[PDB]
């Protein structure tokens, strides 16, 4: 009987199917890929795991590079399959969209409409999940789906702009290919989420900035109507360079002197034309006559 | 300071000597501390001390 | 249909991975047709965990002196082989006779000392050095599992030579290791495509699909695994005796 | 107690299903709506409570089993003491008859 | 001075010229703070989309004593969102989900739970068997299984080391060799493996896909030396082009005259209707091991 | 992001007319290696060399354990039926004797 | 369930029958439209439910019956899963002529 | 028992969130309203329990 209960749990875990993925790097050579998965049974039960693909050698991944499926317990009820992981503030966030049926008050003919809400939670230090931040994206969803979300597959993409400490959330209409964002392109809408939970809807100028991110959007296969999901990626402009560098301390010859407080607080990058310029601001260090005891 | 010392005291009371040593070396280690692959210049690891 | 595995005669060979992955049916008009797609099975030379596997299989598997291979030949082997004595218990020099090429192939697992000259003596007395009938020196001294190319049809003398001595020195006798003979067996390794067949019986009708005609691609001729996979086999199952 | 823990764990799927069901609007006409906005959250809290109760039942079962085991060990010690007493008296008898 | 090295360029910023405010000359703490230092990092050697920039803080006296040296390295990562270097997830109609990166595909899910129910109808003596542990898995999308047999180890032919590597060829847009498999030759018998080669419409470049074997001291990747495969639209199956010498044969780009047999492999074939058993080094290896 | 062959070439020769090999750096700590090759290696290069030395040491330990486990005479043995002699085992025997 | 392969001349032994086992998965079928079925080699329970729903945004509020087909399966430990639900109101109305 | 205490403490955030969510009106049209006025108070009592 105990083995049969174990088999029930085993079947539940083995029946999981991956639904979205995020790569925590600007390129696919190193980093972690985080997957969210869904159960076969007709419940909104979601699990998550990750894999270290830096261990890939000729396409073979060792079994220890993978991680156990861990269940998310925060009352997630996404709309269709618009749920995906993302990492910003160096911790695992879960972002999804919910749909509700609302009516406008004070109209003698009661007309109903779908309200689309973007929810965002994060994973706390002890393994629990926070209370999700909630935003209204009904206008963006309607604009990208041309007010036909029943016929068009609404899609969600989330990327982490670590250089600005922000979260880029795109809502788009799943197609075969995508053009550059902003202006004439109305099938993609953008939102920017800050570290405190506040949000700003992106305009055309800022939307044109992240146009190279369209390669990480889900597309419908040309050969047969087959969906091919794509891992979202951490975003950077052209090169990702750390924003600071704590150089450390050192002890000189004969234990006479010490170099202390060596750090570069600001490191900025500029990629104009095809030359990269890296600026180190306020690089400082202290020299002191001191033996370490 | 206060949390690693409490953890060290509880581990010492339960007689988990190696774990207690690990938990008190966050505050003080007579052998020094290895930072960036070298012995750090400070004597105490707790900065206010 | 997962047919399973089987063990052949004398614990010499094993048939593995026998399975029909797809079995389709077609009931058109009144005749029933059953098609078996990709019927496959692998033939391998292997013993059911005893001395024959560890020793005789490797003895035939050793590449011949002239042209390697050594598949499809005729061999004489022993039924049971047991250690007799000497200095210690090495892997034990166990001999296999290739009777179409006149070959002695010896197998051993360990060697006592590299500095001591060692050769093979086959003699029906074991302790009698002069009562031998075969004496073969190891070409390198610090090597095992070698073949010797007798040349003569000394099958009769090979059978009278019970025991097998790896010591074989003239500084006295100095038997390092020695094994026994017990019984004797004769086997042939060559196979026939007309003899590699799948036979089906549906009621009163019987259909045979041999590897000559219904095969997809023959395996590489070797002592290791040989997978045979057949073309879609069609069966006219229209005279099955339906009881209940 | 094992059955009690199993029954406590049995209700979590039903709690989640009820939370999912109660989110659907249930009034129609010129006054539409009725969705219970906190249904999923209440279902999650309920499954947490059921998990806690199941853990408590399982812990109680294991505690009683271990108490029985230690009690049997003390009985074994008592049995050994009685056997030793009997053997010692059997030797005292030989001394007394000498 | 602070000295920075970016690839081949080297900049030095001394405290004579690049100093912001020079500290008071004393035996106590002396903090040196520099002006914004500009580095022309346009010659960084990018290996796997990452390049190092070396920064050294150095301070020495006239006697030559090193007052202090601190070395550090900064990693500059290059953004690469090219469509052929983006991980993407697909799900075949058989239920197999795979993650594809470039040419490589990785199985993500498992389908043993569905097959375990019929076994569990009987006792668990039927679940915990070798037959159940050898259950086949559906293939990772469109592709074919190729059987390779590699010879016994021969130092004269292969080299002083028994290792071999297998490389794939005309896939995606890359004509060059990409590592696909690796192993070690067995000195007593041949080595037999079965590799899954993927496929997509227009994925195979001119003449078809190449699979070749290298041993060091030799790499059989000349013309017609590696095994060539292609997808014949007429028969709707994968065909080996150079299984034998040919004065003419059909390839991905039509009929080609001079066809030479593959080299390096003892035997190469196409395993028809082959489904590999479940893998115990896959993503579900933990669950398989725990079950069995 | 580096190449061990290139780093070993930067450090060679080892005062003996020989190419510096990963085995010769077994041997000394990361601080020692940085101090000795302060003029030829950067911080990242020294860190990479140290890590590769550690990984090679671990691999050699694993290989030695793997060989001795199969060479153990105590498993000779009804468990010996499911034991195979590896090519690396044969090579180790032919190199190091008994 | 019963195993009618044991039938001999219309007589069934009492051991071929099986104990009644209670279904606990919140089943509320419409009339007697509940039945078992076996696919995927495991027991499934399939039934239909009827609810009274109205059409939103119509000045004469008209009510109609919505028929939902529900399907649950029996898990390995004897518990029942959460039902899949599909809408078959069109089929029900078509076959019953409204 | 430790896991039981943790699972008991895990539900307080969800209780507070449900109390916040149930304060929003849920009927619209020409008859609005639907707020559960005591949702926050019930959430607070639940977290105390």
CA distance C149 to C101: 7
CA distance C120 to C135: 5
Residue B46 DSSP SS3: coil
Which of C209, C224, C227 has the alpha carbon at shortest distance from C71?
C224
Sign, CA dihedral F33-F37-F43-F48, equals negative
8 Å CB contact between A171 and A144: yes
What contacts E256, CB < 8 A, 6 or more positions away?
E207, E248, E249
CA distance C168 to C137: 9
Assigned token pair, C163 = 């025991």
**Chain D hits for G26, Cβ within 8 Å:** 14, 17
Assigned token pair, A206 = 């800022």
Chains adjacent to A (≥3 CB pairs closer than 8 angstroms) = B, D, E, G, H
B40 at the A interface (CB within 8 A)? yes
Q: Do E271 and C22 touch (CB under 8 A)?
A: no
CA distance G23 to E2: 78
CA distance E166 to E195: 10
- Mutation to test the F interface, candidates E73, E76, E154, E188, most F Cβ within 10 Å: E73
Q: Do F42 and E153 touch (CB under 8 A)?
A: no
Pseudo-torsion of CA E12, E16, E20, E26, nearest 10°?
120
E118 at the G interface (CB within 8 A)? yes
G55 at the D interface (CB within 8 A)? yes
Pseudo-torsion of CA F58, F59, F64, F70, nearest 10°?
120
Chains adjacent to C (≥3 CB pairs closer than 8 angstroms) = E, F
CA distance C110 to C114: 11
Helical segments of E122-228, H only: 124-127, 130-133
Give the nearest partner residue to E281 out of A3, A63, A237, using CB atoms: A63
CA distance C121 to C106: 11
Assigned token pair, E115 = 């097959």
CA distance G75 to F64: 48
Using CA atoms, how far residue D27 sits from A104, D36, E96, G5, in Å, is: 15, 12, 42, 53
Q: Do F97 and C49 touch (CB under 8 A)?
A: no
Using CA atoms, how far residue G70 sits from B27, D24, G30, G81, G89, in Å, is: 62, 17, 11, 11, 13
Which of A65, A54, A15 has the alpha carbon at shortest distance from E283?
A65
Q: Do C114 and F81 touch (CB under 8 A)?
A: no
Using CA atoms, how far residue E134 sits from C38, D76, E279, in Å, is: 18, 49, 9
8 Å CB contact between C162 and C180: yes
- Min Cα–Cα distance to chain F from E195, Å: 23
Which of F88, E187, E149, F90 has the alpha carbon at shortest distance from C63?
E187
Assigned token pair, A66 = 């993978």
CA distance E109 to E95: 9
Give the nearest partner residue to E73 out of F42, F87, F90, using CB atoms: F42
Q: How many CB atoms lie within 10 A of CB A35?
A: 26
Q: How many CB atoms lie within 10 A of CB A55?
A: 13
Length of chain B: 49
Q: How many CB atoms lie within 10 A of CB A142?
A: 16
- Mutation to test the F interface, candidates E53, E54, E186, most F Cβ within 10 Å: E54
Q: Do D13 and G81 touch (CB under 8 A)?
A: yes
Angstrom resolution of this structure: 3.1
Q: Do A128 and H17 touch (CB under 8 A)?
A: no
CA distance A40 to D54: 25
- Please name the residue that has the structure tokens 């470039």: E102
Assigned token pair, E98 = 């795979």
A282 at the B interface (CB within 8 A)? no
Assigned token pair, D86 = 């009997």
Q: Do H28 and A75 touch (CB under 8 A)?
A: no
What contacts C13, CB < 8 A, 6 or more positions away?
C7, C43, C44, C45, C46
Bridge partner residues of E37 (DSSP): A280
Chains G and D touch (3+ CB pairs under 8 A): yes
8 Å CB contact between G23 and G45: yes
What contacts F61, CB < 8 A, 6 or more positions away?
none
Assigned token pair, F39 = 């003029």
Which of E100, E218, E116, E236 has the alpha carbon at shortest distance from E165?
E218
Give the nearest partner residue to G57 out of A7, A41, A110, using CB atoms: A110
B48 at the F interface (CB within 8 A)? no
Assigned token pair, F30 = 């990361």
Q: Do A292 and B41 touch (CB under 8 A)?
A: yes
B to F CB pairs, distance under 8 Å:
7
**Chain F hits for E78, Cβ within 8 Å:** none
Using CA atoms, how far residue D81 sits from C135, C187, D88, in Å, is: 74, 71, 11
Helix (H) or strand (E) holding G72: strand G63-73
Half-sphere exposure of A203 (CA within 13 A, CB side): 1
8 Å CB contact between F34 and F42: no
Helix (H) or strand (E) holding D51: helix D39-97
- Min Cα–Cα distance to chain C from E272, Å: 7
Q: Do A58 and E182 touch (CB under 8 A)?
A: yes
């Amino acid at each position: 009987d105990a083995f049969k209960t174990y088999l029930t749990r085993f079947e539940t875990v083995a029946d999981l199917k991956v639904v979205s993925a995020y790569h925590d790097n600007v390129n696919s050579n190193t980093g972690l890929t985080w997957f969210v998965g869904q159960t076969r049974e007709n419940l909104p039960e979601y699990y998550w795991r990750n894999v270290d693909i830096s261990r890939m050698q000729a396409g073979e991944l060792a079994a220890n590079a993978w991680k156990e499926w861990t269940k998310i317990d925060t009352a997630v009820n996404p709309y269709k399959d618009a749920i995906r992981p993302v990492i910003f503030r160096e911790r695992l966030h879960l972002i999804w969209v919910e749909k509700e049926e609302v009516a406008k008050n004070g109209t003698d003919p009661v007309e109903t409409y779908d309200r689309f809400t973007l929810k965002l939670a994060f994973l706390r230090h002890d393994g629990s999940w926070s209370a999700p931040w909630s935003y209204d994206i009904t206008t963006q969803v309607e604009a990208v789906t041309d007010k036909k979300p029943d016929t068009e597959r609404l899609a969600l993409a989330a990327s982490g702009f670590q250089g600005e400490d922000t979260l880029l959330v795109f809502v788009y209409k799943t197609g075969k290919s995508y053009s550059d964002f902003g202006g004439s392109n109305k099938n993609v809408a953008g939102m920017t989420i800050y570290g405190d939970g506040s949000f700003k809807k992106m305009e055309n100028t800022a939307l044109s900035r992240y146009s190279q991110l369209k390669n990480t959007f889900d597309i419908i296969h040309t050969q047969g109507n087959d969906l091919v999901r794509k891992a979202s990626y951490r975003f950077a402009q052209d090169f990702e360079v750390p924003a600071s560098l704590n150089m450390g301390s050192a002890i000189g010859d004969d234990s006479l002197t010490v170099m202390e407080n060596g750090n570069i607080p600001q490191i900025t990058s500029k990629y104009s034309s095809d030359n990269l310029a890296i600026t180190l601001h306020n690089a400082a260090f202290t020299v002191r006559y001191d033996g370490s005891g | 300071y206060y949390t690693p010392m409490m953890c060290f005291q509880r581990l010492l009371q339960e007689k988990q000597f190696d774990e207690a040593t690990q938990w008190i070396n966050y505050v003080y280690n007579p052998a020094g501390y290895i930072v960036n692959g070298e012995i750090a210049p400070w004597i105490w690891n707790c900065r206010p001390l | 249909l997962n047919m399973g595995s089987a063990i052949g005669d004398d614990s010499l060979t094993v048939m593995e991975n026998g399975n029909i992955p797809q079995i389709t049916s077609k009931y058109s008009s009144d005749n029933l047709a059953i098609t078996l797609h990709n019927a496959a099975f692998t033939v391998r030379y292997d013993g059911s965990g005893n001395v024959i596997r560890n020793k005789q299989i490797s003895a035939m598997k050793l590449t011949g002196v002239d042209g390697k291979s050594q598949y499809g030949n005729a061999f004489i082997i022993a039924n049971t082989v047991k250690h007799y004595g000497g200095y210690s218990d090495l892997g034990g020099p166990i001999t296999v006779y290739n009777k179409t090429k006149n070959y002695i192939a010896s197998v051993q697992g360990h060697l006592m000392n590299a500095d001591y000259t060692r050769r093979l003596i086959l003699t029906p007395v074991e302790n009698n050095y002069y009562a031998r009938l075969f004496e073969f020196p190891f070409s390198p001294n610090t090597i095992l599992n070698t073949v010797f190319t007798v040349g003569s049809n000394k099958t009769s003398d090979f059978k009278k030579c019970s025991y097998a001595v790896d010591g074989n020195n003239s500084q006295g006798f100095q038997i390092f290791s020695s094994y026994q003979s017990s019984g004797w067996l004769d086997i042939d390794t060559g196979i026939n495509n007309t003899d590699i067949k799948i036979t089906v019986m549906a009621g009163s009708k019987t259909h045979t699909f041999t590897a000559s005609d219904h095969i997809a691609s023959l395996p590489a001729n070797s002592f290791d695994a040989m997978p045979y996979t057949f073309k879609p086999l069609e069966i006219d199952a229209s005279s099955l005796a339906f009881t209940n | 107690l094992d059955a009690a823990a199993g029954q406590s764990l049995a209700g979590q799927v039903l709690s989640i299903a009820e939370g999912v069901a109660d989110l659907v609007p249930n009034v129609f006409g010129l006054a539409c709506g009725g969705s219970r906005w906190g249904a999923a959250l209440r279902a999650s809290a309920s499954v947490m409570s059921l998990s806690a109760t199941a853990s408590q039942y399982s812990a109680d079962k294991i505690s009683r089993s271990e108490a029985y085991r230690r009690r049997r060990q003390e009985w074994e010690i008592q049995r050994d003491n009685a056997d030793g007493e009997v053997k010692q008296m059997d030797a005292q008898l030989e001394s007394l008859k000498i | 001075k602070i000295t920075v090295m970016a690839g081949s360029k080297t900049h030095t910023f001394t405290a004579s010229d690049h100093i912001a405010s020079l500290p008071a000359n004393s035996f106590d703490a002396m903090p040196y703070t520099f002006k914004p230092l500009e580095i022309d990092a346009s010659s960084l050697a990018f290996t796997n989309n990452i390049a190092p920039l070396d920064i050294v803080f150095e301070t020495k006296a006239k006697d030559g004593r090193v007052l202090g040296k601190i070395k550090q390295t900064l990693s500059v990562k290059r953004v690469n969102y090219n469509p052929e270097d983006i991980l993407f997830l697909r799900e075949t109609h058989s239920g197999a989900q795979y993650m594809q990166l470039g040419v490589y595909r990785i199985r993500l899910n498992t389908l043993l739970a569905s097959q375990l129910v019929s076994r569990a109808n009987t006792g668990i003596d039927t679940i915990l068997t070798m037959e159940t542990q050898r259950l086949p898995e559906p293939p990772l999308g469109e592709g074919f299984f190729a059987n390779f047999v590699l010879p016994k180890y021969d130092p004269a032919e292969h080299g002083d080391e028994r290792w071999f590597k297998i490389h794939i060829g005309n896939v995606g847009g890359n004509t060059g060799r990409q590592p696909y498999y690796s192993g070690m030759l067995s000195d007593t018998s041949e080595t037999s493996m079965t590799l899954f080669v993927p496929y997509a419409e227009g994925y195979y470049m001119h003449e078809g896909v190449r699979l070749g074997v290298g041993y060091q001291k030799i790499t059989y990747d000349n013309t017609w030396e590696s095994a060539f495969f292609y997808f014949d639209e007429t028969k709707q199956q994968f065909v080996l082009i150079n299984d034998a010498d040919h004065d003419s044969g059909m390839t991905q780009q039509g009929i080609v005259k001079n066809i030479k047999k593959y080299k390096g492999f003892l035997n190469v074939s196409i395993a028809t209707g082959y489904s590999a058993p479940m893998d115990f080094n896959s993503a579900s290896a933990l669950y398989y091991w725990e079950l069995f | 992001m580096y190449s061990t062959a290139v780093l070993l070439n930067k450090i060679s020769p080892t005062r003996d007319g020989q190419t510096m090999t990963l085995a010769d750096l077994q041997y000394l700590s990361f601080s020692e290696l940085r101090k000795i090759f302060d003029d030829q290696l950067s911080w990242g290069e020294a860190r990479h060399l140290y890590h590769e030395t550690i990984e090679q040491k671990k691999n050699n330990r694993l290989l030695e354990a793997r060989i001795f486990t199969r060479a153990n005479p105590q498993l000779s043995g009804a468990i010996r039926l499911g034991i195979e002699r590896d090519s690396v085992s044969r090579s180790y025997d032919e190199m190091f004797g008994a």
